[PDB]
Amino acid sequence: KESYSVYVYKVLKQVHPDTGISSKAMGIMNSFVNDIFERIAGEASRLAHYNKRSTITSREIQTAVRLLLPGELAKHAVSEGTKAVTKYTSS
Amino acid sequence: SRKESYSVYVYKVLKQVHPDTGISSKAMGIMNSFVNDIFERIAGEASRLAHYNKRSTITSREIQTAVRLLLPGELAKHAVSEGTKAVTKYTSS
Amino acid sequence: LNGGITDMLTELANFEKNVSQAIHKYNAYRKAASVIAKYPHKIKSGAEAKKLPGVGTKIAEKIDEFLATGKLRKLEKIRQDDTSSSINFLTRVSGIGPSAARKFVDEGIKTLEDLRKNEDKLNHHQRIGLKYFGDFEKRIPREEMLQMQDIVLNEVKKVDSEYIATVCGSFRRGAESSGDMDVLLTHPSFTSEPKLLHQVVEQLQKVHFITDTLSKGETKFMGVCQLPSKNDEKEYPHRRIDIRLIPKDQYYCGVLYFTGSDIFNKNMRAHALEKGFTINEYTIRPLGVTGVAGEPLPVDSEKDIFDYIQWKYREPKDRSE
Amino acid sequence: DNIQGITKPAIRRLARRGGVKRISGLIYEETRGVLKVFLENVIRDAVTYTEHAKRKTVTAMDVVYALKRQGRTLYGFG
Amino acid sequence: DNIQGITKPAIRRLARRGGVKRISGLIYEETRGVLKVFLENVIRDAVTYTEHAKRKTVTAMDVVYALKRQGRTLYGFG
Amino acid sequence: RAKAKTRSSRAGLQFPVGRVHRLLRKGNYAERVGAGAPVYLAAVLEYLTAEILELAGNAARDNKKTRIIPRHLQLAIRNDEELNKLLGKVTIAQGGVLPNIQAVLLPK
């Protein structure tokens, strides 16, 4: 089936080149990714509906990420998201 | 401007409940809040269950399942007891 | 003196190549069969045959079981398998391989009757193979092969006098028969630094020599051709002819590589590597102290290629090994 | 009737892994009520969610979804 | 230093409304700290949700929504 | 074209029906909204509201006051058992707390 396993393995290899991953660990990581995506999407949708707009855009996702994530992680994530958005928009 | 509420329906239901009762405006506000909260919770449960079953449209069976899942205990047994009797009336057509 | 063991390993390798789709097993089984058949002695024990290269624990055990029981339970089970036999039959026709045979057997196409009934399920190459599978299965006599080679050389010379045609392979090596024709073509205007092959194909088809075409490109063209009958005898079977056009700086190397034999080619490559040169189908290149290959040397004749690796030139009749 | 299956040494081991020092008498019996209450309040909703799909066998995803709707999410069981 | 605004009579009255009988002499600082923690953890998200609207005024319904997110869902007002 | 009857009038329900269908359709909560779902949801809302209001009326009649007060409503809501479970984390504005005192601390 389709999951995030391949991308997870690639990211783990990039992060550290001398480690191994159990299959149960891969499943745990897949569940974590799915849960985080669902929570962020739900918060964004609720914020969008409450704001009396009609679409989901980058600013909404950024505000939701600020609302949900813990502090220092939120700051680092906001920086990374801004940098990636600049990179993609520079295309 | 204009905004939606359930004040008139609440007043009619209260008159049906007892012909000799008063209530304040803040009571109507609290009742509106309770109604909105319950409706939102039921709708969310229904949408989640429908996505889990991977169907495409909401039917009364899903609503019955959600009501059985959400409401606390024996009251739901009474509550669902009305709904089919309610539904049958519309099924009376 | 291991004809029976070689015959059984032939079916084992065919199963591993076309049914099991195991190149790493098919090559090993073929090598073990070749080592068994090349030994001019009867195999008495599997341990005795394990001394010869290419035979391992599995090969020795199979040889011992074949000696003890006269056959293999696995071999008999694979022979009695309808699906495996159907896959082998479907892959036996050229143009259909392991996956083609598997799809045909999965779709119910198991015999040549189904293939004739499902020609729409057969491509141009597949339909061509289905039309002349028995004709492709027949060998080419040395007289018929020589007549076809003379006709092809005449057509090449008439198309362009500057064209150079070489009948390489066992025909060059002098074998009494061949399963197909392999022609190497050269031209002064086409070097290492496109319509010549198309013109050659058109010239061959104009005299009604080439009967069918499976693929025709600017480099190699493959088709079915047959030596004509003299209006009273039976028609000659269709034979597969492949003509490859090579550069003038690469024609000699290609002819040397395709002339054979495989053992002779391997020995020549080993001698060249021991002589500080690398010999390929394209050209021959110098080898450095660190093994970096230099600019490939110009090639003009087989004798020059032999002298490049500091080895005596050997005639194709003596090129068995 | 099988509720007595959980051995006293087993519950003692569980509590010891929890970080206790001494277990009195009545607690061993009392733990049964908590275990049964939690298990029932889970299994009933799980079976309801299973039956809502007009199936017959309890599926692992059903238990996962029920636990999530029960406010305790346990990621890892697929 | 407005945190000293919550007076000792006020804290005592609130605790009595809770139904307390005897309050020790080391409660004022703890109560002030707890109140500060709760007010901050609500107001930060309140201001964030307000700013997401790109408006310069904090609305009561924004406070209600923020309290709902933090696990209060206090109905009534708004 | 005779005098048409509303859906709630057709099926004998009190709370709004059509507006519920509009809200569900515009709520983006599903791809397609069915028929009986609005009826069932409206009926359930009616039953719950009726139960709460009846408890409130009983409380107010006990307290000898003609108009329902928010504190009376809160006391009625928190007094029962099932409603306490169903509304276990809601703070009613200007509601109050149930009159109860710890027994052990009480003088004796």
Next chain:
Amino acid sequence: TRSSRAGLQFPVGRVHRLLRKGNYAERVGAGAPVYLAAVLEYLTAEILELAGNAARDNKKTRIIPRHLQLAIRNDEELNKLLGKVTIAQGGVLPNIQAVLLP
């Protein structure tokens, strides 16, 4: 690839498809997959890095589930992120009260 063009790691098109078909909003924006993928990658990288530090401290050579549990429960930020979530065969952090000890 679009994710490659953005230099991301996860398949951005998959996220776009999931969000579009997820019935979570009326209209899909412009670069929402990019931001979502970046956030997911940052979180996954942080979790994996803490796990790798713990594993190197563990003198092991594979991501055991207990290692992931210890890594997640050993840092305050991750503890707040997933405090109310359980893991399988994970165990608890080693801790004993000082008052009980001899």
Next chain:
Amino acid sequence: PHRYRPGTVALREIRRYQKSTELLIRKLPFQRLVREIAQDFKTDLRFQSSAVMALQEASEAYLVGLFEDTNLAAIHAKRVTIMPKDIQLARRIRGER
């Protein structure tokens, strides 16, 4: 000359406060505290009065819950007075660290 028992007035005060439904916190101090606390995060924020009232309501509810928890726990501790250690334990048990 006539004074009540050493702690009898406490029970009467408990009953009186329990019966009532007043605000119990002076509005001006709460408004000042809200302004001061909000000053740190963002500058020049203008609120509406209803928001201040609602924040007061929620704060009262949270403090009441914590105090009731502390009283129950201290009762479980076989002690009569309420001390900060009990408050810390109560905040720890519910998972508020």
Next chain:
Amino acid sequence: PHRYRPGTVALREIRRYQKSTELLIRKLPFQRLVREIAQDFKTDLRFQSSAVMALQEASEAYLVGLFEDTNLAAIHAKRVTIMPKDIQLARRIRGER
């Protein structure tokens, strides 16, 4: 032979089972309990083994958490033995009572 200190064995193996990742519960009894509890809801429902294992895992987690919280709360009682009243108080203050 050598009589160990009072609780020396008890204090021991706390570190051993603390680092454990096994189930520490008899499997077939758990399956029987699950089936018996299930028999009251509906009639003759089949179950999958992985689901039973996951249910056991969640149950172990919840029980471990409750017992540990109860021990921590009972520590505040200046007592060294956990008692049923302590677990009662822990459940009541946990909000799930």
Next chain:
DNA sequence: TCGAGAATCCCGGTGCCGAGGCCGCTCAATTGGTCGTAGACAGCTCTAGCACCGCTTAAACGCACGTACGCGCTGTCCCCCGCGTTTTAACCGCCAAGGGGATTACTCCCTAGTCTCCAGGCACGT
């Protein structure tokens, strides 16, 4: 048990403002048609659940014994409930004053939708 004094219930004689009464008025709910498809059903195949059987053995059970920690009891002293007294800033009354939020008409441009378009992997065959 008992009284002096403090907390509590009550009739009413006033006010008073706002909850419920009324009308005037549209934009959303209804009807009656249409089309275009999600799942209801009928019919199939393949497996993970289900049911024993015998062996091994290891965790579980029951029973003696020492001991310590829970649980009474005691005195002791210290901080806090209650009291009275002297300040004061919330609180209510009034005022102005202006700026951020609603609205409303206008223009722009960005994703849903449709439709090519492909080259990055599969095979034959060697």
Next chain:
DNA sequence: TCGGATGTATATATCTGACACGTGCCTGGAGACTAGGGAGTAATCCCCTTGGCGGTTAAAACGCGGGGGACAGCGCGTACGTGCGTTTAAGCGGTGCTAGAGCTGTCTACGACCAATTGAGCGGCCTCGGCACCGGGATTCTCGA
């Protein structure tokens, strides 16, 4: 004094790479190109927050008991861990048997869409009666006796 517990050397339980090249097939997700409907932009009321000044007094700060609760310690005994010898069911494989999960092809009843048609709920405005507040009265609980 010694059993539980840290390493290093040594022997099992798994994982794993060792031809590729030329030539055709074969599809699932990138670009190209609208449109029209959703979002940005400028102009104007306004009302609702903001700020300010003065009396006013119920509320809050502060000093002073004494006395009742927090705490500290002591004996004791009885519930509870600890060692040991037995035992029953839990694993650990087997073995066979099959209801039921899952998947695939009709087709059809039903849900979305739309243009008239209309009247139930919303906005705006009275009013007198539920509610309210003192105010003095009588009624009742209690803590030093």
Next chain:
DNA sequence: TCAGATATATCCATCCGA
């Protein structure tokens, strides 16, 4: 088809408070 590594068990030469 094959051992070559590589991760993974022990154990019995030590170390310690208990």
